Each structure stands twice: as structure tokens, then as C-alpha cells.
């Protein structure tokens, strides 16, 4: 059926890569989806249909995409929904005043930013990305949305993979298409 | 003229930032465009209008976008045109067999990749990105398209900025919207 029909076709288009990006990790490459407009259309329609059914009476203001894979489908989904798109980037890339969030890893940390004036306080947003695994960048994006005094309605991911490092807690509902 | 109207309105949405990313460079941020679906669509319509005039009797097979600002509008443009999208990424990120190209800077280098199986030989391609300044990544992307034995029809950029380091030679015509 509908969302499930699209999910099925998209799953079959993924390419499996064992031991990537590290040994033991079974990677799934979604890039083939973008190479074919027929498949790309179904990816966007699947998320659009999901959001229309998940929030029939709640207004979505922005799609927040995570660098860089979330940039591949997030902006198009935003346009398809008639809403704005705002990126979360690795620190040091965005111009202007930015809110910052840190993801502490075993060794070192990952810094993320979002432009302070990009989303008004009270806005409702959906954070999107390709893969949800350890969840570091997703959790960080969540903190940034909170600093903007915006509401995180849900996270939308294309897939879930096991990067062998456990899972960081996400403080919002999660929908994973595949 | 339609494309003139789009360009003028899009230019007004840009935000200036002195000395970014480094001292002496006057940056222009196009991110506000994506925050407004009406403006975002005008950006897409502007590039569509250009390509329809530039390649009336030539089939475009793929839009190749550069990481990561090219990912913000490249996929969207691709789907709007009904063609495929393929990313060029900084080395070490893409899964699968990849072609490699190096951008030699004065005191370092930037390595780029494209998946070998992403584009069939003989395909017609348009490379897109936000800013054309030094042209380093753009030149590397051109070399990658050549390794795929594909035809580079043109480069499409949103804007041109002066990064104070000259501009590398590009082996294909260039179109800059703003």
C-alpha cells in the first residue's frame, strides 16, 4: 500500500556496502534513489504523505536538514510541503550569529551550528537526515532547535543503521521510512 | 524579463558578511532564500528558465552538485527538470568505487570523489554549486565528469565571489545567476 509501496521500491534501490565506513558496519547507500527521478519522487512523496498523516492538524513551519545527507532530500521535501528549509551545519561553515551544540564522543567532539535568525521562536519543525545510528548529530540538532525556542515535532530518517556504538537518547518521536 | 525579475528579488534576499570565511572576503549568504518557499521556487524557476534557453535541443541527463551548498538546490533543480542528481563529495565520504580528482591549492590540497557507477558514459551533465570563486572544487568536479566519460554541458552557479586567490580555468561555459 501507498507509503509502504514507496518504501518497498526505495528499499530495493539501496546498495549494501559491508564494512563501511568502518569494519563491521553494514552500510546502505541511498544515493541511487537520487539518480532516478522516478525514485526521488517517491522518496519525497513518502515523507510528505507521512507528515500529512502524522500532523493533519498541526502546522509545520520548517524542515531542518542535517549536513550533508539531509540536504539531499530535505530542501525538496520542504518545497513539496510549502514550508521553509534551514540547515544544521558542522561548526565554522555558517555565516552570521549561530547557536552551537556539542556532541561529545569517545575521542574528541563534534560541533554543530544553526543560524540564530533562521527560525522564529514558537515555530514547529521536523529534523531530517538519511541515517539514524549513534544519533549524535540528530541529538545535537535537537539541542539547537531548543535554543531557537522552537518545537521539535519529530525526526524523519530514511533508514536506521548499526554503527556499533549504541544509541544516544533523542527527545522527540522518530519516523524511519525504510 | 521573467529571469530578470527572479534574479533581482533573489539578490535582495542575500545577506552580506564582511571578512568571511576569512579576512578580506566579502561573503554573500544565500540561505535566507531557502527559508521562504516562494523565493526558493523562484531560484529553481530561474535556473530552469536558463537551461531551457541554453539547451533547447540537448537532453540533460544529470545535475551534479558540489558538497555541500550545491546539495541545497541541485537535487531540487534535478527533480524539477525530471533528471537525475549525483553528488561530488570531499574524499572519504562516498561508499563504493569512486573516481578521484585533486584540487591543488598553494599550500595544500582538497581531494574530491564521484561514484563510478553513478553516470553512464555519454551522459550530458550540468555541474552546480552556490559560489564560484577560486573554482577549485568546480575544476575537480569537471575532471571527475571526464573520468566518467560524460559530457559537461555547463557550470551553473548562484553567485560569484572574490576569495582573493584568482580563479582556476574551467573547461566548460559558466552561467552565474546573480
Curated annotation (Swiss-Prot), chains A, B:
HAMAP family: Aden_phosphoribosyltr. Catalyzes a salvage reaction resulting in the formation of AMP, that is energically less costly than de novo synthesis. Changing residue 93 to A: Small increase in activity. SUPFAM superfamilies: PRTase-like. It is found in: Cytoplasm; Nucleus. GO terms for biological process: adenine salvage; AMP salvage; purine ribonucleoside salvage. PANTHER family: ADENINE PHOSPHORIBOSYLTRANSFERASE. Changing residue 107 to D: 2/3-fold decrease in activity. Its EC number is 2.4.2.7. Homodimer. Keywords: Cytoplasm, Glycosyltransferase, Magnesium, Metal-binding, Nucleus, Phosphoprotein, Purine salvage, Transferase. Belongs to the purine/pyrimidine phosphoribosyltransferase family. It comes from the Eukaryota. Changing residue 106 to L: 1 million-fold decrease in activity. Its main location: cytoplasm. The keyword Cytoplasm applies. Changing residue 103 to F: 4-fold increase in activity. This is Adenine phosphoribosyltransferase 1. AMP binds at residues 133-137. CDD domains: PRTases_typeI. InterPro entries: Ade_phspho_trans, PRibTrfase_dom, PRTase-like, UPRTase/APRTase. Changing residue 69 to A: 4-fold decrease in activity. It catalyses: AMP + diphosphate = 5-phospho-alpha-D-ribose 1-diphosphate + adenine.
